[PDB]
Write a protein that binds this ligand. Structure first.
Ligand SMILES: NC(=O)c1cc(Cl)ccc1N
Ligand SMILES: [Cl-]
Ligand SMILES: [Cl-]
Ligand SMILES: [Cl-]
Length: 163
């Protein structure tokens, strides 16, 4: 466990994280993909061996001794708002189980379903709130990675509002 488990946000490539494991915003088929998934494929390509897993699940594959947790958020282009919301909640619950199983003291995590899988909507608050519901009961340091300057500000304010 971390000595005083914390949330932090950084605006940078998750492939340069300083944490003990990474969460990939994966597709269900274990393909190289785009955005976070493409950066993760370039940095840890060995982790894509048998990484296919269903929507709403997470599957960990080791790159050497470094764990890559492939977490599959719903594509809101295909899911109803209702079903998509349930699968996005479920994907983060499976990340919390894997983080706990691995015994890591820190994890790098992107906001699932907020890019190509967003169905054209702003899902910062929806995705971040499902991240908190899952990770609040874990004692790993959680470092959230984003690329937009306005998103960094809003994530930081959300963390600070809980004090
Ligand atoms: N590689 C990343 O950290 C990243 C890339 C995109 Cl396009 C969006 C969010 C991210 N965290
Ligand atoms: Cl960067
Ligand atoms: Cl996405
Ligand atoms: Cl972002």
């Amino acid at each position: 466990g971390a000595m005083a488990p914390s949330y932090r946000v950084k605006r940078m490539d998750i492939a340069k994280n300083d944490e003990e494991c990474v969460v990939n915003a994966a597709n269900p088929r274990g393909l190289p993909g785009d955005g976070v998934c493409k950066a993760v494929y370039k940095k840890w390509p060995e982790s894509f061996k048998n990484s296919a897993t269903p929507v709403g699940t997470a599957k960990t594959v080791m790159c050497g001794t470094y764990p890559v947790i492939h977490a599959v958020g719903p594509n809101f282009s295909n899911y109803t708002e209702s079903e998509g919301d349930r699968e996005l909640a479920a994907a983060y619950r499976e990340v919390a189980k894997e983080v706990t199983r691995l015994g890591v003291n820190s994890v790098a995590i992107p906001l699932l379903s907020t890019g190509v899988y967003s169905g054209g909507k702003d899902r910062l608050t929806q995705s971040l709130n499902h991240l908190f519901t899952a990770m609040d009961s874990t004692d790993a340091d959680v470092v959230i990675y984003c690329r937009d300057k306005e998103w960094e500000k809003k994530i930081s304010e959300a963390i600070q509002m809980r004090t």
